Structure 1
């Protein structure tokens, strides 16, 4: 459903297809599809506030379709930065398994770094959490001391009994 095809040894026109869902209209004359894309995207741009969040994406897409001499390295750099932002949808040759792996790993690896950038509370929470299991040693000591106190009560009661001789 996401693709189009027509195929025949000699072009076969199925009369049961019927009318299409396209509408005829007039518009500007463009020599190449890149010119049309650039014109539409530029028209979309310049009508938004400079602080809008999608403006960098529009700018990147605009500069990606620019054709010129000696711009191969710039186009490669722009395409790389567009892949890093998750917009270009690699066309399944080499960057869907290498660049995708690289950037997902490079987002997973600095996770300890970015949690440590403000994770100074982790030491406090760990200390409190393990205290939540240790400091009950005070209650355990109190229970042992209570048992020793009753034992000493029995001891000294026997001592009083024997002291009468």
Structure 2
């Protein structure tokens, strides 16, 4: 369950003595980019948290790229959804031309009697 890493992060944020500034800063960065620390409105809310929001929007193209194999199919089906209808339109045009040719050949039978 998620819990246990969060409990360890909170514990390590407290405690500690000499020579642990870099380690504690590294811990707090991961603790606050995961929505557990509640930035205290000085620098991280606008620097590392905003970068975290960008990196939340950053890998959406990356992950849909791993899911674009059925997005190329989405696009192909979406366009074929309107392209093949040209065949219905062509059939309608051919029916109109058939009516024309019906009139024309009736006239042809009218003329050939002379």
TM-score by length of 1: 0.67
3-state DSSP of counterpart to 2:55 = helix
Higher helix share: 2
Root-mean-square deviation (Å): 0.8
Q: Name stretches of at least 5 consecutive residues in structure 1 with no aligned partner.
A: 1-51
Q: Alpha-carbon deviations, 1:43-63, whole Å to 9, x = none? A: xxxxxxxxx320000000001
Looking at structure 1, the residues matched to 45 and 61 of structure 2 have their Cα atoms a distance apart, in angstroms, of 26
Q: Alpha-carbon deviations, 1:14-59, whole Å to 9, x = none? A: xxxxxxxxxxxxxxxxxxxxxxxxxxxxxxxxxxxxxx32000000
Q: Alpha-carbon deviations, 1:105-150, whole Å to 9, x = none? A: 0110111101111221001111011100110000000000000001
Looking at structure 2, the residues matched to 125 and 90 of structure 1 have their Cα atoms a distance apart, in angstroms, of 41
Looking at structure 2, the residues matched to 81 and 94 of structure 1 have their Cα atoms a distance apart, in angstroms, of 15
3-state DSSP of counterpart to 2:36 = coil
Q: Greater relative contact order: 1 or 2 (C-alpha under 8 angstroms, separation 6 or more)?
A: 2
Q: Name stretches of at least 5 consecutive residues in structure 2 with no aligned partner.
A: none
Q: Alpha-carbon deviations, 1:45-93, whole Å to 9, x = none? A: xxxxxxx320000000001102210000000000000011110001111
1:160 offset after TM fit, Å? 0.2
* Runs of 4+ off more than 6 Å: none
Rg (Cα) greater in structure: 1
1:75 aligns with 2:24: yes
